Symmetry: C3
Subunit: 179 residues, 3 copies
Amino acid sequence: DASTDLQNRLSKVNSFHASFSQAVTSSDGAVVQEGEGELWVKRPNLFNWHMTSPDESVLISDGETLWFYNPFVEQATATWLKNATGNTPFMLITRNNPDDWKQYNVKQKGDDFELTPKSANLKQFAISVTPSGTIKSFTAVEQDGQRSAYTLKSQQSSVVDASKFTFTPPKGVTLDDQR
Amino acid sequence: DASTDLQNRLSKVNSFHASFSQAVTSSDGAVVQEGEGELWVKRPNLFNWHMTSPDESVLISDGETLWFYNPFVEQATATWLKNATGNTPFMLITRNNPDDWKQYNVKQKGDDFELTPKSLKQFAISVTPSGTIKSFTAVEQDGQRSAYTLKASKFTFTPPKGVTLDDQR
Amino acid sequence: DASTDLQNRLSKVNSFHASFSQAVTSSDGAVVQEGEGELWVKRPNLFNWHMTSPDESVLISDGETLWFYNPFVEQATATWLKNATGNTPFMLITRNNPDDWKQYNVKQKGDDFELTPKSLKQFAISVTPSGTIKSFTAVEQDGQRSAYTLKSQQSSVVDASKFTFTPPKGVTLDDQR
């Protein structure tokens, strides 16, 4: 019931945009880092995730290649998307693949879902999503108790020009091409 | 006996306040973060731990409920204190529970105590003979180190409006 | 093959200095921290690693003792270097010890080497044929990545004073020696 319901809710909106706030907190309650950004998702296999502060970070899927880019160390990494897995709440959300969801035991409390893996450094993921499909927040907890929490705002369902899901490494950027 | 000595020292001061500095350093020596805050402890079961810089976070036990709060993402988590464990040096210190201490092999060097789990890598706590806590450190298996140095309505919490509470109770 | 080539390149420059930028990135692409500093190495067994931003941090080997120092919390830690291990890409580089390298399966693609432990997820090191180290990265099992990029590497021999450390006044020393 819980897993099927979560999947049904995520299936309702396949092209959306939203801003986010992030807080990484150790088990003792100390903040490791806080940041902000925005994200765009177009199922299937397309996304643009951009952390804008306090440091910039770029993660984009053009449908074939998954790109990671850090402007500060002037490095990018390229991999084939087909090799990627649902290893972060955001990746699970972009894929919404039944084969991924079956690897977790899912519990539901209203709009709040908790996912605990069936085998083994994660402890559990949490995703809050309304009945109509609005993603409100998501969290990843590690075995050491560290928590990575995201809250989403201004969530709008729209289809943006495909140009958002493309990336070419900027001039002067060293590409670690694992493809 | 090092465990007994540590417990004896901790049991000397059951109600206290201190300000703290914190530094989180990875095994390669890179600083992950540095911060400051203050804390109040009143055994049994009450505390207020507050990081004030550079990012605010609150951890409070009202004696029944353990609350975590992060104003930046406006989230709070409530759990029953009965279910908490001494999984951080601060928690071990607030509880000072023999049942927690017996889960560690404790070595002593003057005021410096090192604790290794029988079943993280290790915790360290420095406390004077009179029970003044000077510092405590937690080390993970990957070598990351979290080091702290130390220098009634307080034990209550009411989630502010617009805060989303994950009530695990 | 690859491990022998990596070692051969590292053996060409035993005394050098470099400036570095660092970026710690979680598996979701979120930057945990960014920083910069400089480092000096003189094999065997001597080094001075200094982070200037976001906050000061100092890691020095005077050839016998390994020192960690954080001025903000006013703490230092001393241990015997003989007990140190090649537990980070930086330490592996300072040691360039065949006995360390053997604990890893090494793959090569031009100047890019990738090391996977036989018994941490992976380490990666880039070094030119002439011995110029360009970058190194560590990846944990949780997918968090610590990436260092090296700039202005100079093969030089600085004064021996760079490889010494005395705890400043008022710093508490955790002497594990």
